[PDB]
Amino acid sequence: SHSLRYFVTAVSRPGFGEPRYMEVGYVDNTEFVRFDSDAENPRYEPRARWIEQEGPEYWERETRRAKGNEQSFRVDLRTALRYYNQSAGGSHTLQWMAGCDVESDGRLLRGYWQFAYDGCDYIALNEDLKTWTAADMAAQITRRKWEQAGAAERDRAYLEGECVEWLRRYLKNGNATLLRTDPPKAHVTHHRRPEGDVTLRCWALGFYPADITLTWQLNGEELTQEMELVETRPAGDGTFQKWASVVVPLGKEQKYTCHVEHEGLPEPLTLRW
């Protein structure tokens, strides 16, 4: 699956002017556009070569949408101090994420339209794209207004139509980067433990996309219970990496196998120490 997501952040800083307002656009968790109100020329900007192709009409449209958004966020930050009875002196944050996950055939899997205030859930459109979850009494006030306004219906139209169609476009103009499959390259390190034991860590490097399955096996069964790992993480060059470790006895390294599966491998990799 592929996703188009817009991560919006407004941070108030009372006495140092207007809230800092940022939008960041991602196709499949790689950045392709940004708008920052603190830029010398606050404008929607390209962050990947493949989006540059778009017309002046595109950038001016997006710039104005961001500007409009910045205004709405200013008003909402003020509404929140009222709902939560807070001083106009403190710094607060609103965050909004909106976008679409699409299957390889191009049918929508999941739309998102959700908000958090001060890092806590505020209101979120359910997967039915009809229904709001309001985390608190403040957000119930908003939910009442949005139900009356037909907000969900309008948000759903963007999630089902515009979002999906633009994603489909982005994937093609960007396919060289976005549809690539960089395969993982794997190795195993060996650390003797003070307890007389051995840590075996299986590393997967250089892979794209992010999705991967990394496991440890002994006699054909997985070691899912006693496995240490790290979450998949970016490696500075648009690729990803991950590792997974197990503790094993001193002679028995050779009887343990690391298994890696990824779109860019014809066949799973199997490695030992």
Binding site: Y6, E23, G25, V33, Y58, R61, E62, R65, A66, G68, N69, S72, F73, V75, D76, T79, A80, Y83, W96, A98, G99, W113, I141, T142, K145, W146, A149, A151, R154, D155, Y158, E162, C163, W166
Partner: peptide, 9 residues
């Protein structure tokens, strides 16, 4: 292209 806010909190 991104989403536009219409309804206020």
């Amino acid at each position: 292209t991104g989403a536009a806010r219409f309804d206020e909190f």
